[model samples]
Target: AIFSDRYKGQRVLGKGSFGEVILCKDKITGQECAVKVISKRQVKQKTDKESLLREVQLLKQLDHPNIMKLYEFFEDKGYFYLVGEVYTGGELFDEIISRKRFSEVDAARIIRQVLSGITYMHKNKIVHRDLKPENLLLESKSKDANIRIIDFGLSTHFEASKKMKDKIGTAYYIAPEVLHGTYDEKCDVWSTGVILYILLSGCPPFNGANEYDILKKVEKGKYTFELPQWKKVSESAKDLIRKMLTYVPSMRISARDALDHEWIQTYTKEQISVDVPSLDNAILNIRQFQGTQKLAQAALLYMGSKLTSQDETKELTAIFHKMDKNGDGQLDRAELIEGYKELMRMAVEHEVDQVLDAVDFDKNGYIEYSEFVTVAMDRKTLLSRERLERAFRMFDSDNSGKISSTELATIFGVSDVDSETWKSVLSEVDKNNDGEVDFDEFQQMLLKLCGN
Candidate 1:
């Protein structure tokens, strides 16, 4: 497949039982993305290759900061290559094993991100049938509990009130209704409750020497908060867990509603802190970044997401999540103004308008995740020589070396026949003659725009 041509496969990011993930470089963008290579012909043991392909489609439909992003897929003679964002933070299982126990504040930090992501999923009626610590991923091995839920092999779509019959997911995290072979998306919430229980108590709520014994305990839905750890944990936290782990599926708390529970709302380092986090750099970069070209703006957004490390955006991710005050996954005007004044001290209404105008690329009257990311990222680091060439190559999708109007149309998601827009777009960078832009022209335009 041409997957080989587009990306230069580097080291193995992680090896799986059925497939392999290579830390590959996108030849055009020069940014690192992982290619999940699954061998079709080479099955050491029988594997669910068909289900894996379906899993690819599921991953394609999802786009959340707390969920892994799937870019594209290709099937050749022997393997399937799934190109996506590579996580370097390692697994949450290891983190939990190391921590032994997470404080209520730390546990809330994790559950908030997980709930936010699953809220998106439940809204779409897609349930992650397997939700456990093993599937939980951190974007970086940093202080921030930046959870990126991965491994959607067991995920599927279900209609509202319809029961899913398959008995799936790891033993300890399985819900009571799931053990009975009749459950809905609330099963995921139940699994999350088990995770939260283990998180606060340093042990799984359901455990045994064998799978059967563990599953029986899960079926009974009998978990106690009488441990020494629970004495330290707050009542609201236990209440949230109880609602989530309710034996009756109909009574279980939805992830969306769970985000608004008193426990999640009131317990963000409340027991430990007086100093609130300030959006110093987030405010600084917005004021510095003047209006960029449409192409450049698009390019920056892509490059910022594709190349920017988690550590760089760790604080900004927190700021964006916190500023999205309504829990709607985007910052509306009221939320933006409040965040600007509260976090960045932009008390003037005009300041809010300017920030929103600069960041909101879709111009949908609010700022989405990617929009905030592009503006929050500093230009000096965002537009490196390595990254710009990559951006150019990404735009020139046909591997033509020169970016054409059609390429612009394809990358920008516009009409290929729109010569007018392409002309205006190209004229900004196409210095010597007309339309198509070469690397030199593209490089110079971006640098001059940056005044470097």
Candidate 2:
């Protein structure tokens, strides 16, 4: 949604290839957030656009404090924006750079946070492709320092049935086989090992004059440790690091297994709280009450026309038939409530509580025909671009900023259309010159094909 002069207080936070991020406050709520905005043209040109969409899709499903929260999304003037929570705490890379090195105790603390974030991501089937010092962000802490893994533009979503092999990450920390074009999620494990080495030794394990030599050393699986100087470090810490940096991907311990190791057991548990969505029957009942608002509006509209006597003979008969789905010429309270209840369930499931409530006039338990007429005739409604854009993003799974014929068919479960017909429709609506319809164009196309 386009904001008026209302959102003028935005402060620049960061920038990237496709867009810029800014810190902005919600004028109504006075809440601070980081907004990542990308132009529609830039989105179309993004090579990793599919990855971007997948990141948003995955973040929407995940709710963990350790993971960034996507609070709102909107677009204005061909600029798509995602507003998320911003932790003002400094980044981990900066902290390490300033200190130059860390003691074993401090290193362990940071390592735990890294594991915590990765464990959650892995459980959700997300692989952070770019796992380097720069991407790990820090948050203000009252107890222990915490790290949040950000930047999932290159992350891969793994399926149980598919074997993943894609080389996309920083060269220095990349796994050996990955450089040769054979790797999977375990490649991240190798990168994590490099991170551990840095945390402990205050420097990377392997560095070369060039990329080739770096890979050569990585493939050789050799690393040096000043055992005499590092003798004070715990054996468990060294052992864990050794296991993680193993040459063989299969030999490397998984995130879960590492969590079960002896060194990990020493750290006290700080339970991370996530507000799990409840499916309680009470909520279901509340949702049912909410659904009545729409039919209530319709009933009010029908009543107004009936009272106004505007072409009433036929219109009134049609209204009566609509109210009486059984064609009994009248609607009992029970039947009316049931219809409203179904609508309420839908509104709740789709998160349209405010829209559903807008039409419930008089705050009465039941909506009579008169109340429905008032809402239907007088109430003004505005379409939300955020919801519409999100719907389009959902359709564009690969995130290349365009909805392909195959993607559309998969989303809608339709298979009868010939390839040529689908291509013709796509060609007609893709106006950005990026060769695909974004949310706005897709919405227009849908409206043309199916009137609401």
Per lDDT, the best of the predicted structures is: 1
Model 2 TM-score on a 0 to 1 scale: 0.50
In terms of lDDT, the poorest run of 10 residues in model 2 is 159-168
Clashing pairs in 1: 28-390, 29-390
Q: Estimate each model's TM-score.
A: 0.52, 0.50
lDDT of each: 0.62, 0.53
Candidate 1 is scored at a TM of: 0.52
**Per-residue lDDT of model 2, residues 1-452, tens digit only:** 56533354467775432356788888887888877776675445334557656666767777765666677666566776677778766566544433423455555567776777677777877766567765676776322456766654333422111100012124457778676766766767778878876655544577543334556788887987763434545678778888878878888887777777776666323432322222233222222212222122222223333334423333433453466655434343454444444433432222222323564533455434444433333332112234345445433435667655444443222212234554555566664435445555655554333221
lDDT of 1 at 94: 46
lDDT, candidate 2, equals 0.53
